[PDB]
Amino acid sequence: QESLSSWIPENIKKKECVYFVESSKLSDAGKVVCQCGYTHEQHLEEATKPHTFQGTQWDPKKHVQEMPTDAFGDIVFTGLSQKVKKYVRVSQDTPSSVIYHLMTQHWGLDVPNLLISVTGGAKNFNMKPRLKSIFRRGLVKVAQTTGAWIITGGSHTGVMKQVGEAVRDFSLSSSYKEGELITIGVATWGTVHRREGLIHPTGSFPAEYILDEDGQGNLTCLDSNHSHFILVDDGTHGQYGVEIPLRTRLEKFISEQTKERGGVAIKIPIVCVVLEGGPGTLHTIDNATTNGTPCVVVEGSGRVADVIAQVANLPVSDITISLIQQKLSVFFQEMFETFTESRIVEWTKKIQDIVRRRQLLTVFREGKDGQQDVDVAILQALLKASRSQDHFGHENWDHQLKLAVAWNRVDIARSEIFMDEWQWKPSDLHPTMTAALISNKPEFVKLFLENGVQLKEFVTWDTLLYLYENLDPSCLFHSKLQKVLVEDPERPACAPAAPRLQMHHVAQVLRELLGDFTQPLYPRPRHNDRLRLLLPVPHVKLNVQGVSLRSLYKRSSGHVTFTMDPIRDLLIWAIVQNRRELAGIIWAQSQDCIAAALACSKILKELSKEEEDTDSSEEMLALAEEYEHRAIGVFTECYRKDEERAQKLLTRVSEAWGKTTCLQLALEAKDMKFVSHGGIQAFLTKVWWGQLSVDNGLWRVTLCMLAFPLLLTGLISFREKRLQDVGTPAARARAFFTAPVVVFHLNILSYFAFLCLFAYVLMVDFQPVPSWCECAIYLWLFSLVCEEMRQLFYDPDECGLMKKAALYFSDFWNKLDVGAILLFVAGLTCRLIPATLYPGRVILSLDFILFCLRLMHIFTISKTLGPKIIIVKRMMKDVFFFLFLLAVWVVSFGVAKQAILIHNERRVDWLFRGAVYHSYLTIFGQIPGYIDGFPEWLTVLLLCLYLLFTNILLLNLLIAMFNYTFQQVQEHTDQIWKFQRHDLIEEYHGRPAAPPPFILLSHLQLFIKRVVLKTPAKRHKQLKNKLEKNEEAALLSWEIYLKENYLQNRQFQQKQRPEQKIEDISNKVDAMVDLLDLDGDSYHVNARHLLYPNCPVTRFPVPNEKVPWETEFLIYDPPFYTAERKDAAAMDPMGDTLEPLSTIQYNVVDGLRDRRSFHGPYTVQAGLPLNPMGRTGLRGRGSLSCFGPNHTLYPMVTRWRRNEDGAICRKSIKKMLEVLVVKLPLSEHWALPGGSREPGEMLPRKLKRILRQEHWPSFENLLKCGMEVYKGYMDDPRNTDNAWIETVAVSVHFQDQNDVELNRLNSNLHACDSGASIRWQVVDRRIPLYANHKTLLQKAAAEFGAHY
Amino acid sequence: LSSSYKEGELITIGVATWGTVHRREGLIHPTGSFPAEYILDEDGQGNLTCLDSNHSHFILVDDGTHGQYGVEIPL
Ligand SMILES: Nc1ncnc2c1ncn2[C@@H]1O[C@H](COP(=O)(O)OP(=O)(O)OC[C@H]2O[C@@H](O)[C@H](O)[C@@H]2O)[C@@H](O)[C@H]1O
Ligand SMILES: Nc1ncnc2c1ncn2[C@@H]1O[C@H](COP(=O)(O)OP(=O)(O)OC[C@H]2O[C@@H](O)[C@H](O)[C@@H]2O)[C@@H](O)[C@H]1O
């Protein structure tokens, strides 16, 4: 913060007079004032020394000096507000760059979007209620949408007070909304009431300013609502208007000298608006209009606004000073008599100079425009100024859309610049579509979709590469992509370099976002290894970690045309940025709808899980569920019609997504709702029960299972059977056995019989030796343990051996299986050792039930048991909970049962029997009444007490927390079993139908195969249904037609919802409140223009009535103004012709100086020529060469403009013409190549010696003999009352557009000598050119039938 | 576009004279040109004119002339 406090005194200066020049007119109570009297007996802040010269009427340039500023800091109004406001005291003359740098860096203000400058009457302002309402509403609306910059004067009176109240009440009514309408105030430092407390030698970040409306003399108070303040000082005290020029200069610099994004420059829109004012308002408007800032006036508002609007459409020459005074006195009736002739003529000419420029002025017209809005009117004022100035083609309809992107207003982007004849050429909107997509701004996307912006060819490789470099900085995906570029940095991993984000990085991060699937959407390998392109990697000859097939290595790759998924590419980019409204629009135009929606659901679910900790992981999960329902709807619509093709579509692979077939892609999102919908479980019941049927009963297939002859009878229903495809009973038996249902049945029978076999060898075969029926167990454990080894090699990653066993460790049932194996190992050691048979008789009995838990695991099959055993899966830890609970209840009174009664049955480990073991037996029936039963009354009492808490509180209360919790997640438990159903089908489908007694052979079948084979490429027995092009196109085209059919219902569902219909009525009534409130004489006009170029002076007011020499104007006192180059080289030195040195020939050729007028004889007064056209207001020679006409030649070249075929281009009426124009580096304008006619024939050379040629230019000069168009006096801003400009206009033409005269002009060209640029240009009545030169173009256009 | 892929479309048939076509040189094909591409350009419009990109069917009547206007009204 101290950087500002040190920087401001270094840079900014301030004014203060240093000499005492006592004023003759003593001020009111300020008689001790030296013409400024700021704070002293004199006008000085130091010793009023004579300074060796007591110059009377001290010049401000010589007396006033600049001291470094220290009056900066902050202000807080004492009790009026609580926020802090910034303020800086600035010098009268200060570069705008310093001020802008201050407000950007040291004030934390970003670049604006709109610059509206409001000005009006300060002290004497009267307003009607309709006038007050428009400020109350429309200014606030335009300020709070575009994020405009409200710049105005800082004072406590008038229209700025209305602005302050209208900006404070919106902030208060916004209820602490994000962002505030920033307002900056600019006022002169001299006219401040209590500035004495604001001055602080040090950095006054704390400060207090108290306002008082009582002691207001010539001074004024500041406003308490402006957020920033700028105080300009000029040394004076009561001066009014020392802020207008600084504000006007700074506004243009802010608007037109900052924003340059992808091009030369970008000019921010700028608005000046008035309501009602006086002498300062006219000066402000006149100064602002010369800077190119458009001004809009409101009619029926005040005095100045009304008088300006009254002469809106009047011709410039029709204004008369008597008429101006007549309209002035009637609207200024309060102070009409206070106007003098000088003031009347000054205001007349301010009006005249304002109304000369019709392009920069608009009127609100006292509307029937207000009902539309004032927001609109003030906004297409800018866009009208934009149509008024465009160059060389249809850049207007591009610049308007560039502006409309930043407006955040759709109806303005639609209402004018999409209602006219829009030249389609849809490639225009790609630079605008990109901006709309990036800003988001999701609404403009649809608007561009109605206008034919098709996304299929809009999304190029480079466009998406640029899009992925402009992710949301606060988004999680951008942070992830800001890390992969660092995990694989420039030196060690992407060895050449990798500071640029390129498509392989996003492919790699998407693969992490995806599962263990195939290669992601963008090319990894050496063909497109997009990691290492910043160093000069070799071209096509390299083909290793570089570019192989693409065209050129230009710090890019080339046109990788579309990568066969241009829509899904935008869909992923919109999903990762969490743009909910934008992503739905892109999803509509998708090709592979179901796969894209399922992938979006998975990526949203897994991105929500990583990190933001609130408020967006919930929103990401909600959007994931929304896309889940969106996919379910499309699948339901596709499944209703012709379910057979819907199922085939379900299991197909998708080349555009790294295949991830839809059923497989759904599982990793865990997809509770999608897998449980209808046709999904229908297909699951279709792959299970593989080839037989879906109608046969479960109890009827098991009989044909065991009775092998019974397969061949007419009892079971195959699919081969109805097609009578039974040509081999062994073949239909193979088709029977291959189905997963019978593989499961035979496995369950084998596992049910293995337990009986194990029970056989414990009741009778209790021997310490491996008997006849013992090695069967060893081979059985060998066979079943090898299933897990087969699954380890089933679908692993080819690099991770330990990372795949983690998911096996993640299944507690696999842990139960391996523990049952370990318990078998622990019991076998006791089985083989003969001295521990008794411990082996009690340690293997628990294994019989540890295997029963596993046998219960595989009964997640039945329709009424699966969702029923999933309930006891919720019970599992609470099984232990209630076991620990009920064992403690039992023991609590098992201890107390044997206490009172004297029991005497005791042994070794059998006293424990009669003490504890008989307590649980007395619960379920085994009550020794002849043993358990004086204390008989208490035995009744306590026995009733235990069963009162167990059979009543611990038996029936479980039912409540069973049944209620059953109802709680029953929907979840139903779909969880639906989701878990595929896992059983997955394991038993890719498996041979051989018995586990016969799987021993198949365990070696793939081992002997690897004796011959060497690579794992045997077969892929997964769903993974690959499809041909002829059927893929015949299926995706079918789905798209159904996807749009589904979009019909939901779009119709939204409108049919009763709540939405409340939206329709509410906004229709809002359309009723706004619908029922509807109850001459041509002169040298350019010569009289002020602001003489290259000479900072002014010229005297010369009216439209007093312009001619015949009319007498008694006030005419033009200064004898001469340029700095008036006393100079061979040009006439008569700039000071008061001496008798003025003796050159008038109306005659004075040697080489042809000082004779081509129009007629000009009069001579006091030895000096007078302007024959009239009076200009500036006496002297100016920047011209000599007095009278300065003869010069303006050559013009014209040629026809042809089409591609070579025929002439055609207009509506007239024809098409071209001209050749030049642009000098220090001119910033287009002008004709015309030079001064000081030389005889080299006058064209004087303008085109470095432009046309050196030697061939003389040949072109000989061929320059053409036709003359116009001759005589020219209107020019460089015209004084003595030195004007006279020209001759020659026109040469190129009729043919082939090799002829044009051939000579092309080869002879030697332009690049001292000029900036030169080119042929289309002729138009909007082309950029000098206003004087446009007259020559318009006058000479009739000679060849050009347009206009 | 606003019907959101509704069933049925408002069929429109256009009739213009074959003489006044800008880029008809690419439309002429000796064989059956079921595939074809026509690119419109509003720059090289002399006495000729471009076709519309919204009509569903087109009929081009020819009369031997080139810049004749009104050879389609009677047909
Ligand atoms: N900075 C000022 N603050 C307050 N009152 C002022 C100021 N400057 C002049 N006045 C007073 O304003 C009165 C004249 O009011 P109008 O004729 O309606 O307005 P005008 O004098 O033209 O001033 C318009 C004002 O608009 C501002 O944007 C601009 O800086 C200018 O001062 C006079 O009493 C005059 O002393
Ligand atoms: N009809 C006119 N319309 C607009 N500007 C005009 C016109 N006539 C003269 N000017 C301007 O008046 C100024 C003084 O005229 P010159 O500079 O003598 O004009 P010219 O000889 O045509 O151009 C000389 C060039 O030298 C450069 O260094 C300089 O920037 C200027 O463009 C220049 O800004 C010039 O563009």
Curated annotation (Swiss-Prot), chain A:
<dbReference type="GO" id="GO:0101003">
    <property type="term" value="C:ficolin-1-rich granule membrane"/>
</dbReference>
<feature type="topological domain" description="Cytoplasmic">
    <location>
        <begin position="794"/>
        <end position="812"/>
    </location>
</feature>
<feature type="intramembrane region">
    <location>
        <begin position="994"/>
        <end position="1012"/>
    </location>
</feature>
<dbReference type="GO" id="GO:0014074">
    <property type="term" value="P:response to purine-containing compound"/>
</dbReference>
<feature type="transmembrane region" description="Helical">
    <location>
        <begin position="875"/>
        <end position="895"/>
    </location>
</feature>
<dbReference type="GO" id="GO:0005384">
    <property type="term" value="F:manganese ion transmembrane transporter activity"/>
</dbReference>
<feature type="binding site">
    <location>
        <position position="987"/>
    </location>
    <ligand>
        <name>Ca(2+)</name>
    </ligand>
</feature>
<dbReference type="GO" id="GO:0071577">
    <property type="term" value="P:zinc ion transmembrane transport"/>
</dbReference>
<dbReference type="GO" id="GO:0005765">
    <property type="term" value="C:lysosomal membrane"/>
</dbReference>
<dbReference type="InterPro" id="IPR041491">
    <property type="entry name" value="TRPM_SLOG"/>
</dbReference>
<keyword id="KW-0106">Calcium</keyword>
<dbReference type="Pfam" id="PF18139">
    <property type="entry name" value="LSDAT_euk"/>
</dbReference>
<dbReference type="GO" id="GO:0033194">
    <property type="term" value="P:response to hydroperoxide"/>
</dbReference>
<keyword id="KW-0739">Sodium transport</keyword>
<dbReference type="InterPro" id="IPR005821">
    <property type="entry name" value="Ion_trans_dom"/>
</dbReference>
<dbReference type="GO" id="GO:0002407">
    <property type="term" value="P:dendritic cell chemotaxis"/>
</dbReference>
<dbReference type="GO" id="GO:0015278">
    <property type="term" value="F:intracellularly gated calcium channel activity"/>
</dbReference>
<feature type="binding site">
    <location>
        <position position="1330"/>
    </location>
    <ligand>
        <name>ADP-D-ribose 2</name>
    </ligand>
</feature>
<dbReference type="Pfam" id="PF00520">
    <property type="entry name" value="Ion_trans"/>
</dbReference>
<dbReference type="GO" id="GO:0005261">
    <property type="term" value="F:monoatomic cation channel activity"/>
</dbReference>
<dbReference type="GO" id="GO:0071502">
    <property type="term" value="P:cellular response to temperature stimulus"/>
</dbReference>
<feature type="topological domain" description="Extracellular">
    <location>
        <begin position="834"/>
        <end position="841"/>
    </location>
</feature>
<dbReference type="GO" id="GO:0042995">
    <property type="term" value="C:cell projection"/>
</dbReference>
<feature type="binding site">
    <location>
        <position position="1332"/>
    </location>
    <ligand>
        <name>ADP-D-ribose 2</name>
    </ligand>
</feature>
<feature type="transmembrane region" description="Helical">
    <location>
        <begin position="813"/>
        <end position="833"/>
    </location>
</feature>
<feature type="topological domain" description="Extracellular">
    <location>
        <begin position="762"/>
        <end position="772"/>
    </location>
</feature>
<keyword id="KW-1015">Disulfide bond</keyword>
<comment type="subunit">
    <text>Homotetramer. Isoform 1 can interact with isoform 3. This interaction decreases Ca(2+) influx through isoform 1 and suppresses susceptibility to oxidative stress-induced cell death.</text>
</comment>
<keyword id="KW-0813">Transport</keyword>
<feature type="topological domain" description="Cytoplasmic">
    <location>
        <begin position="1013"/>
        <end position="1348"/>
    </location>
</feature>
<dbReference type="InterPro" id="IPR015797">
    <property type="entry name" value="NUDIX_hydrolase-like_dom_sf"/>
</dbReference>
<feature type="binding site">
    <location>
        <position position="124"/>
    </location>
    <ligand>
        <name>ADP-D-ribose 1</name>
    </ligand>
</feature>
<feature type="binding site">
    <location>
        <position position="278"/>
    </location>
    <ligand>
        <name>ADP-D-ribose 1</name>
    </ligand>
</feature>
<keyword id="KW-1133">Transmembrane helix</keyword>
<feature type="binding site">
    <location>
        <position position="1226"/>
    </location>
    <ligand>
        <name>ADP-D-ribose 2</name>
    </ligand>
</feature>
<dbReference type="GO" id="GO:0071277">
    <property type="term" value="P:cellular response to calcium ion"/>
</dbReference>
<dbReference type="InterPro" id="IPR050927">
    <property type="entry name" value="TRPM"/>
</dbReference>
<keyword id="KW-0966">Cell projection</keyword>
<feature type="binding site">
    <location>
        <position position="788"/>
    </location>
    <ligand>
        <name>Ca(2+)</name>
    </ligand>
</feature>
<feature type="binding site">
    <location>
        <position position="119"/>
    </location>
    <ligand>
        <name>ADP-D-ribose 1</name>
    </ligand>
</feature>
<dbReference type="GO" id="GO:0035579">
    <property type="term" value="C:specific granule membrane"/>
</dbReference>
<feature type="short sequence motif" description="Nudix box">
    <location>
        <begin position="1235"/>
        <end position="1256"/>
    </location>
</feature>
